[PDB]
Amino acid sequence: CVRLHESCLGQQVPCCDPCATCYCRFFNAFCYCRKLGTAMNPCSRT
């Protein structure tokens, strides 16, 4: 998988971090792992 917060180029490389998924900051360029900014119910982010 990908690192904690890096590019996954292709969107086929899911984040190696639990509850973490690659997201693109734009159309298709800034696609990197994301730990989900769920301040209400965050997963693995301590």
Short mmCIF file of N, CA and C in Angstrom, two decimals:
data_model
loop_
_atom_site.label_atom_id
_atom_site.label_comp_id
_atom_site.label_asym_id
_atom_site.label_seq_id
_atom_site.Cartn_x
_atom_site.Cartn_y
_atom_site.Cartn_z
N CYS A 1 0.84 -1.23 0.00
CA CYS A 1 0.00 0.00 0.00
C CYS A 1 0.86 1.26 0.00
N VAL A 2 0.24 2.40 0.26
CA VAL A 2 0.95 3.67 0.30
C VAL A 2 1.35 4.02 1.72
N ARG A 3 2.04 5.14 1.88
CA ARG A 3 2.48 5.55 3.20
C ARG A 3 1.35 6.22 3.97
N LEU A 4 1.70 6.93 5.03
CA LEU A 4 0.72 7.60 5.87
C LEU A 4 0.06 8.76 5.13
N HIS A 5 0.85 9.50 4.36
CA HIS A 5 0.34 10.63 3.61
C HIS A 5 1.21 10.95 2.40
N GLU A 6 1.06 10.15 1.34
CA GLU A 6 1.82 10.36 0.12
C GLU A 6 0.94 10.11 -1.11
N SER A 7 1.49 10.39 -2.29
CA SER A 7 0.75 10.19 -3.53
C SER A 7 0.56 8.71 -3.84
N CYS A 8 -0.60 8.37 -4.39
CA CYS A 8 -0.91 6.98 -4.74
C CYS A 8 -0.94 6.79 -6.25
N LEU A 9 -0.73 7.89 -6.99
CA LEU A 9 -0.72 7.88 -8.46
C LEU A 9 -1.47 6.69 -9.06
N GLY A 10 -2.71 6.93 -9.48
CA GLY A 10 -3.51 5.87 -10.08
C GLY A 10 -4.78 5.59 -9.31
N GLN A 11 -4.78 5.91 -8.01
CA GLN A 11 -5.94 5.68 -7.16
C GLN A 11 -6.17 4.19 -6.90
N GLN A 12 -5.28 3.35 -7.43
CA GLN A 12 -5.40 1.91 -7.25
C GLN A 12 -4.58 1.44 -6.05
N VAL A 13 -3.75 2.34 -5.51
CA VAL A 13 -2.91 2.02 -4.37
C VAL A 13 -3.50 2.57 -3.07
N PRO A 14 -4.34 1.78 -2.38
CA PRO A 14 -4.97 2.21 -1.13
C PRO A 14 -3.95 2.43 -0.02
N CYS A 15 -4.30 3.29 0.92
CA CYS A 15 -3.41 3.60 2.03
C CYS A 15 -3.20 2.39 2.94
N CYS A 16 -1.95 2.17 3.33
CA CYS A 16 -1.61 1.05 4.20
C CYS A 16 -2.10 1.31 5.63
N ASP A 17 -2.60 2.52 5.89
CA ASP A 17 -3.09 2.88 7.21
C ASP A 17 -4.58 2.56 7.36
N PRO A 18 -4.97 1.92 8.48
CA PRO A 18 -6.37 1.57 8.74
C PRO A 18 -7.29 2.78 8.63
N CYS A 19 -8.42 2.59 7.96
CA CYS A 19 -9.39 3.66 7.78
C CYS A 19 -8.81 4.82 6.96
N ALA A 20 -7.67 4.58 6.30
CA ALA A 20 -7.04 5.61 5.49
C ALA A 20 -7.25 5.33 4.00
N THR A 21 -7.62 6.37 3.25
CA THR A 21 -7.86 6.22 1.82
C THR A 21 -7.27 7.39 1.04
N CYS A 22 -6.79 7.11 -0.17
CA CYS A 22 -6.21 8.14 -1.02
C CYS A 22 -7.28 9.06 -1.59
N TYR A 23 -7.04 10.36 -1.48
CA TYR A 23 -7.98 11.35 -2.00
C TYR A 23 -7.25 12.40 -2.84
N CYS A 24 -7.94 12.93 -3.85
CA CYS A 24 -7.35 13.93 -4.73
C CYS A 24 -7.81 15.33 -4.34
N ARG A 25 -6.84 16.23 -4.17
CA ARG A 25 -7.14 17.61 -3.80
C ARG A 25 -7.73 18.38 -4.98
N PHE A 26 -7.67 17.78 -6.16
CA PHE A 26 -8.20 18.39 -7.37
C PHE A 26 -8.78 17.32 -8.28
N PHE A 27 -8.83 17.60 -9.58
CA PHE A 27 -9.35 16.66 -10.54
C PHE A 27 -8.62 15.32 -10.44
N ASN A 28 -7.36 15.32 -10.88
CA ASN A 28 -6.54 14.11 -10.83
C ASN A 28 -5.06 14.47 -10.79
N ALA A 29 -4.59 14.91 -9.63
CA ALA A 29 -3.18 15.28 -9.48
C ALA A 29 -2.71 15.12 -8.04
N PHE A 30 -3.33 15.86 -7.12
CA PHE A 30 -2.97 15.79 -5.71
C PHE A 30 -3.68 14.64 -5.02
N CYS A 31 -3.45 13.42 -5.51
CA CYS A 31 -4.07 12.23 -4.94
C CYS A 31 -3.12 11.53 -3.97
N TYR A 32 -3.37 11.71 -2.68
CA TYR A 32 -2.54 11.09 -1.65
C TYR A 32 -3.39 10.53 -0.52
N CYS A 33 -2.79 9.65 0.29
CA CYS A 33 -3.50 9.03 1.41
C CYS A 33 -4.12 10.08 2.32
N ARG A 34 -5.28 9.74 2.89
CA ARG A 34 -5.99 10.63 3.79
C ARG A 34 -6.56 9.84 4.97
N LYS A 35 -6.26 10.31 6.18
CA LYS A 35 -6.74 9.64 7.39
C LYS A 35 -8.16 10.09 7.76
N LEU A 36 -8.84 10.75 6.83
CA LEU A 36 -10.20 11.21 7.07
C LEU A 36 -10.24 12.19 8.23
N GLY A 37 -10.52 13.44 7.91
CA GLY A 37 -10.60 14.48 8.93
C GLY A 37 -11.89 14.43 9.71
N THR A 38 -12.19 13.26 10.28
CA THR A 38 -13.41 13.09 11.07
C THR A 38 -13.14 13.39 12.54
N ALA A 39 -13.06 14.67 12.87
CA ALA A 39 -12.81 15.10 14.24
C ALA A 39 -13.91 14.62 15.19
N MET A 40 -15.05 14.24 14.63
CA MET A 40 -16.17 13.76 15.43
C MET A 40 -16.01 12.28 15.75
N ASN A 41 -15.51 11.52 14.79
CA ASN A 41 -15.30 10.08 14.97
C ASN A 41 -14.13 9.59 14.13
N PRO A 42 -12.90 9.99 14.49
CA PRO A 42 -11.69 9.59 13.76
C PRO A 42 -11.26 8.17 14.09
N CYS A 43 -10.71 7.47 13.10
CA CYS A 43 -10.25 6.12 13.26
C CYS A 43 -8.86 6.10 13.88
N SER A 44 -7.92 5.55 13.13
CA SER A 44 -6.55 5.45 13.57
C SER A 44 -5.80 6.75 13.34
N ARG A 45 -5.86 7.65 14.32
CA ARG A 45 -5.19 8.94 14.22
C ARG A 45 -4.88 9.50 15.60
N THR A 46 -4.00 8.82 16.33
CA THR A 46 -3.62 9.25 17.67
C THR A 46 -2.12 9.52 17.75
#
